[PDB]
Amino acid sequence: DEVGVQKCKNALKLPVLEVLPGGGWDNLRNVDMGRVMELTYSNCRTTEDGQYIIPDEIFTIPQKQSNLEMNSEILESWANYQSSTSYSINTELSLFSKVNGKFSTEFQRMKTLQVKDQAITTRVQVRNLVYTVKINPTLELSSGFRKELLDISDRLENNQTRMATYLAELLVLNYGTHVTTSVDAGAALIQEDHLRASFLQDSQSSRSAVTASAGLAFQNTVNFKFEENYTSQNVLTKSYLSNRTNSRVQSIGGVPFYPGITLQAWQQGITNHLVAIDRSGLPLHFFINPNMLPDLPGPLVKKVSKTVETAVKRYYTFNTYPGCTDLNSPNFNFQANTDDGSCEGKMTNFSFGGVYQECTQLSGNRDVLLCQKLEQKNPLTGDFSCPSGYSPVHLLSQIHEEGYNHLECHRKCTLKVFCKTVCEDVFQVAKAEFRAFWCVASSQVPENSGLLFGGLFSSKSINPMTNAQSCPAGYFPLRLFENLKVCVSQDYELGSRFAVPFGGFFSCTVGNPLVDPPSLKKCPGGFSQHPALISDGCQVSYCVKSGLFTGGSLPPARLPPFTRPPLMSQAATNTVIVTNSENARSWIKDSQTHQWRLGEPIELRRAMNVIHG
């Protein structure tokens, strides 16, 4: 016998359509993930023209459509970005429609050419759509994707919410945020020039000559062999080249491009080299419903669907950077995705009144003393209070957990042979509540502000004013939530070399009050948001106006998981039996299912006991 795709290939002798829907899709990075739907090849289906083997649950639409532009299209801002290969799945109506595709390599290469070079972008393309490939609505889930939903399903039964939240975020690492429901199979040949923005500013009649020049250069590049056999029609073609900044040529599908392959010959190689030039989709929790999971109860597949909808929404929030996006404004935030709407600030210097953190031991007394290495007082008062010109603002209040360890051993001998030694090692969890506060200038008349620095570093982050996990010259750190150390000096002479303008803290629950004269958790205005660490799903951010914090390169996406699996109380024993003599036999029955077994002089049984919560 013979099964699968290869049974179809031997009977028909024709290839398989390589552009298939039903896979996962990361909609921030525009990459495709593991396979969510099930692909079966039982019925040996082909396309209606009889040239590709397709799966059973997939129907194709023949729309053998070719498009050719004699023009270009001008994109003078990176905010209204066109993806050119995943356009329909990014333009969906949602909360985070402005963040889709903003970590793609095709976007981040385009943004760094319009800012570095002060440029505008043109695009000419020859698109060749051959098939639309869709999924039948009566399709079932994949074997691997169903298994990982059932593992989330088990944790919701046992009331294990923190461990289900962890596994829901690993589903988004492996399967993305969306499922592709239709793909467009075809090829495309794309030109992408970058021109100086001064070259477009002439008129609205110059625009229709810039645009038809780029389409003329594209047809020369395909036809004329890199040589200067070009049909350069004007001086405007020659003036186009001198303002041109970058000029990439990209082939997507088909045969590889080289300058000189005619448009006829590129279109002969499209056959059997087809890629997805467009995609449509639905979010990942749409397909977690009682129809797809018929072997689970009704309200229990709605807990799985809600804990994955929360994990996808958490992934968009941690990759959102509001800031000033206008490159001509003086406070331009490079490394910012969303237009903050605050492009003109007032440059108000503020007073940093210091931080302090309370602690409250909940369990595990006289063993760890959690409320000693987790407690910080304000250097301006030496107390858990702000000074006279200040007022406290509550940042965040969570529970910290650490583990401590007992080790007990006793030895017993029986009939002067057969020494028994048991060694028990209990691991328990000690908890503590902390409440971190923060001081704000609310009296409007200080003499001196105090503590002139506002830069941070975590146990996993780096202070950018040192490029290390250290303080600058003459700075002492102040401990915060679990791992933050805020560098602080009140010297006013040796501290003013490294002192940055500080803007305020805010988190997912509280806002800073330095914007309104509750709060807004935006920014003061003119400053730039920068993230501190994440305290178990909540993000703490701080504002600053250096310019050193802003620039650099574009960061990659923060990938899940954003939490860690929690600590559990444990126990481990070690029983050793030592026979101190020959002429001493021993029989051991290890459990009720074992049989009687002749014993050995050294036994060494082991056991590890874990309790969840």
Ligand X SMILES: *[C@@H]1O[C@H](CO)[C@@H](O[C@@H]2O[C@H](CO)[C@@H](O)[C@H](O)[C@H]2NC(C)=O)[C@H](O)[C@H]1NC(C)=O
Ligand Y SMILES: *[C@@H]1O[C@H](CO)[C@@H](O)[C@H](O)[C@H]1NC(C)=O
Please give the residue ranges that form the binding site for ligand Y (CB under 6 A): 159, 407, 425
- State the minimum distance, in angstroms, from the CB of residue 500 to a copy of itself: 14
Number of residues in contact with ligand X under rule CB under 6 A: 8
Closer of 157 and 344 to ligand Y (Cβ): 157
Q: Is 161 left (phi over 0), alpha (psi -120 to 50) or beta?
A: alpha
Does residue number 555 form part of the binding site for a copy of itself (CB under 8 A)?
A: yes
**Element (H or E) spanning 167, and its range?**
helix 161-175
**Which residue type sits at 562?**
F
Residue closer to ligand X, measured from CB, 243 or 320: 243
Q: Which is nearer to ligand Y, 168 or 451 (CB)?
A: 168
Residue closer to ligand X by CB (options 243, 546) is 243
Residue 424 Cβ vs ligand Y, minimum distance, rounded to whole Å: 9
Question: Do 599 and 586 form a contact (C-beta atoms < 8 A)?
Answer: yes
Cα–Cα distances in angstroms (integers) from residue 350 to residues 149, 266, 303, 452, in the given order: 50, 62, 46, 10
One of 160, 223, 232, 243 touching ligand X (CB under 6 A): 243
Q: Is 242 in the site for ligand X (CB under 6 A)?
A: yes
CA atoms within 13 A on the CB side of 449: 19
540 and 553 Cβ atoms separated by less than 8 Å = no
- Minimum separation from the CB atom of position 161 to ligand Y (A): 7
CB-based contact 76:121 (threshold 8 Å): yes
- Which residues fall within 8 angstroms of residue 154, CB to CB, at 6 or more apart? none
Q: Is 593 in the site for ligand X (CB under 6 A)?
A: no
Q: If binding is defined by CB under 6 A, does position 71 make contact with ligand X?
A: no
Of the candidate residues 445, 598, 608, 611, the single one contacting a copy of itself (CB under 8 A): 608
Contacts of 101 (CB under 8 A, 6+ apart): 27, 28, 30, 81, 83, 86, 90, 107
Q: Of the two residues 340 and 358, which places its CB atom closer to a copy of itself in the complex?
A: 340
Both tokens of 49, joined, read 């023209």
Residue 256, binding choice from ligand Y, ligand X, a copy of itself, none, Cβ under 5 to 8 Å by partner class: a copy of itself
What does the alpha-carbon distance between residue 32 and residue 488 come to, in Å, rounded to a whole number? 45
The mark string for 21-50 relative to a copy of itself (x by CB under 8 A, - otherwise) is ----------xx-xx-------xxxxxxxx
Least distance to ligand Y from the beta carbon of 285, Å? 22
* DSSP 3-state of 360: strand
Find the shortest distance in angstroms from Cβ 117 to ligand X: 12
Which residue lies nearer to a copy of itself by CB, 84 or 381?
84
Pick the binder of ligand X from 67, 88, 158, 198 (CB under 6 A): 198
Q: Which residues in 565-594 contact a copy of itself (CB under 8 A)? A: 568, 570, 572
Kindly state whether residue 203 participates in binding ligand X, applying the rule CB under 6 A. Answer: no
427-456 residues near a copy of itself, rule: CB under 8 A: 427
Of 143, 204, 205, 583, the residue at the interface with ligand X (CB under 6 A) is 205
**CB 350 → a copy of itself: shortest distance, Å?**
17
* CB of 439 or CB of 514, closer to a copy of itself: 514
Phi–psi pair at 572, nearest 5 degrees: -145, 125
Which residues are CB-neighbours of 177 under 8 A, at least 6 positions away?
A: 25, 26, 27, 28, 283, 284, 312, 315, 316
Give 390 or 463: the residue with its C-beta nearer to a copy of itself: 463
| Site map (CB under 8 A) of a copy of itself, residues 230-269, x = contact | -x------------xxxxxxxxxxx-xxxxxxxxx--x--
Q: How far is CA 277 from the centre of its chain?
A: 24
C-alpha distance from residue 319 to each of 29, 98, 593 (Å): 11, 12, 54
Q: Where are the beta strands (DSSP E) in 253-318?
A: 275-283
Residues within the interface to ligand X (CB under 6 A) = 196, 198-199, 202, 205, 239, 242-243
